[PDB]
Swiss-Prot record, chains A, B:
It catalyses: TSAVLQ-|-SGFRK-NH2 and SGVTFQ-|-GKFKK the two peptides corresponding to the two self-cleavage sites of the SARS 3C-like proteinase are the two most reactive peptide substrates. The enzyme exhibits a strong preference for substrates containing Gln at P1 position and Leu at P2 position. Residues 1-305 form the Peptidase C30 domain. Residues 1-305 are cytoplasmic. It comes from the Viruses. It is found in: Host cytoplasm; Host Golgi apparatus; Host nucleus. Inhibited by pyridone-containing alpha-ketoamides compounds 13a and 13b. In turn, alpha-ketoamide 13b (tert-butyl (1-((S)-1-(((S)-4-(benzylamino)-3,4-dioxo-1-((S)-2-oxopyrrolidin-3-yl)butan-2-yl)amino)-3-cyclopropyl-1-oxopropan-2-yl)-2-oxo-1,2-dihydropyridin-3-yl)carbamate) inhibits SARS-CoV-2 replication in human lung cells. Inhibited ex vivo by michael acceptor inhibitor N3. Inhibited ex vivo by compound 11a and 11b. 3CL-PRO exists as monomer and homodimer. Only the homodimer shows catalytic activity. Interacts with host FBXO22; this interaction promotes the proteasomal degradation of nsp5. The chain holds residues 3264 to 3568 of 7096 of the full protein. This is 3C-like proteinase nsp5. There is a cross-link at K5, K90 (Glycyl lysine isopeptide (Lys-Gly) (interchain with G-Cter in ubiquitin)). The gene is rep. Coiled coil: none annotated. Cleaves the C-terminus of replicase polyprotein at 11 sites. Recognizes substrates containing the core sequence [ILMVF]-Q-|-[SGACN]. Cleaves and inactivates human TRMT1, preventing tRNA guanine(26)-dimethylation of tRNAs. May cleave human NLRP1 in lung epithelial cells, thereby activating the NLRP1 inflammasome pathway. May cleave human GSDMD, triggering alternative GSDME-mediated epithelial cell death upon activation of the NLRP1 inflammasome, which may enhance the release interleukins 1B, 6, 16 and 18. Also able to bind an ADP-ribose-1''-phosphate (ADRP). The active site is at H41 (for 3cl-pro activity), C145 (nucleophile). Changing Q189A: Does not affect ability to cleave and inactivate human TRMT1. It comes from Severe acute respiratory syndrome coronavirus 2.
Amino acid sequence: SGFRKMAFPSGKVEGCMVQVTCGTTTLNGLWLDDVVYCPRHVICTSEDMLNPNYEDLLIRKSNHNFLVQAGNVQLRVIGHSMQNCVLKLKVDTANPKTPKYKFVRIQPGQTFSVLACYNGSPSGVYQCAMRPNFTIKGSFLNGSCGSVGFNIDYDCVSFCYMHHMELPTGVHAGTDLEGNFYGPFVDRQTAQAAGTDTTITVNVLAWLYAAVINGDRWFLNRFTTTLNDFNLVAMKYNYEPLTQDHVDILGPLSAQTGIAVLDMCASLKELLQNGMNGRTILGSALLEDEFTPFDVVRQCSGVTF
Amino acid sequence: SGFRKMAFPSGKVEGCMVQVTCGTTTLNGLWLDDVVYCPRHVICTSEDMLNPNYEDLLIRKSNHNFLVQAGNVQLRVIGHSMQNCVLKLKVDTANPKTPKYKFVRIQPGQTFSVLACYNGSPSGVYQCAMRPNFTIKGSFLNGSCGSVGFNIDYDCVSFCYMHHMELPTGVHAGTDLEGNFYGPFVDRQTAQAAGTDTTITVNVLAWLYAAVINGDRWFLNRFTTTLNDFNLVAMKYNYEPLTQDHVDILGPLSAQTGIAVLDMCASLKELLQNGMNGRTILGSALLEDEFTPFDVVRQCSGVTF
Ligand SMILES: *[C@H](CO)C(=O)N(c1ccc(C(C)(C)C)cc1)[C@@H](C(=O)NCc1ccccc1)c1cccnc1
Ligand SMILES: *[C@H](CO)C(=O)N(c1ccc(C(C)(C)C)cc1)[C@@H](C(=O)NCc1ccccc1)c1cccnc1
């Protein structure tokens, strides 16, 4: 029993973290096979930040201007390439610790674990969600750039996020591992609107199912609703619209608890309209939207890696 | 910026997790040097549970009755001993992945990371606190027994918790690595009172400082208070009494924010007496007590390992 914000075991990613330095700037890189991946703004200096011409800046760099350290081991850089907003440094040694891996571009509302790193050394691991507006609400200090987000499936690491920057609003922005930003963001020091966020409705419902499985059931009610009716309430409260695809992915949790999805929607509707009256659900006084339906079943089933 | 419930990177502990089998029962063990540590109730069968005679049960076992598997391959058990509530299986191979480590017994109110495992394989990592009543509010399914809690300091792992059981109330109990239970619990299937829990006051204050550091400040008020007067309110709201030692360990956070400890106490007093009125602090609608003062400084300073 119990329900925690649980991250993946970080060992397979820890063995991939290196330090990348280019002149003044140091940050983290990801060493997989014989390539190191890192944010391209490693080649900026403090006067480039407002609008760097990354092509012009990279042209002034040669292989030997990039220092890559894996623990105490020095990697020899034998090629460099820019792909979108990431730098790819070819090194002359394949990482002996390379896990089986893929690069994925996740969808808003999906979750992943973050291994926060400084100077190529891991400091902590935590779980978060890609917000509907393509920010993440992370914990990142100066120098955390190049930290990565990932999911693990048995033995295979799916890398989905590389950290690039903090916005003036204190939330975080980054790229997939092909260097394409999530959302509208660019890697320069300008004010950048993230735009309206919403609550991930399918995740809230998943977490209510997790609550019922753990015995927290006071919120269950005598009502039901329709998808159209519920979506009227969702929009009033800035929740994402629920689709039949969402209902389908909630099927296994509905089967385990015996609570039809539209009946759980009616419970959520009443919680939105009436609040929680100073009660809690799974230790929380707010509705939590950072657990996917897969997250709930994995934690309520014991899947290992 | 940002503040998350951050666990330690779990890589150094992942390489120590093995599967232990004694007849029917399988759980997790911790392989350090040439010894495997696991809960002694691995030697129980399903009729033993109400009050096992562990001495008698262990006498009917010999070295070859214990099967230790580290991923692929079996270890050879060459000795066995019971220490309090843990079994120590001497194996013929020192773990090549043994990190530098210590065994520590932690104090109520301290935090640690848990690596939840099943069948010797890591499934997830999360941070938690030893409650004042010596339970933990974990996430543990059947077979999680033997999962361990730990802290890391640079390269040294301090193991502080081994998971043993879930109480009928849904909370979790375990031992230090010398096999001494935290709290009054015994490893048998009986109803066991955990007794009254309290909120860890010094941790709540620490988290309020983390909030101010991250810009959340609506709760700072014009009042101050005394240690005596604050403890009056603390006792009404089932908070641990604040001592001068607690004031002292909050010193670094008080200095970094310019807010004297007793001033933060007056803010907490007003929060306890008036609630939050639909506001949030660091994304939470409850007062959080699972971050120690050291947890805050580490996450706000970027200490690596
Ligand atoms: C990364 C290593 O320098 C880093 O930590 N960092 C950062 C990111 C991007 C850039 C440019 C402008 C793309 C060159 C510079 C530095 C800081 C950071 O984001 N600074 C700029 C910033 C911060 C906040 C609001 C507006 C602008 C960083 C700090 C904390 C978390 N992530 C990144
Ligand atoms: C450990 C592997 O069997 C396990 O998961 N587990 C458990 C723990 C202790 C015992 C005895 C009674 C000490 C032999 C048996 C089994 C279960 C568990 O705790 N079962 C007993 C129980 C009693 C009261 C309330 C709940 C459970 C376990 C399940 C979930 C989390 N931790 C442990």
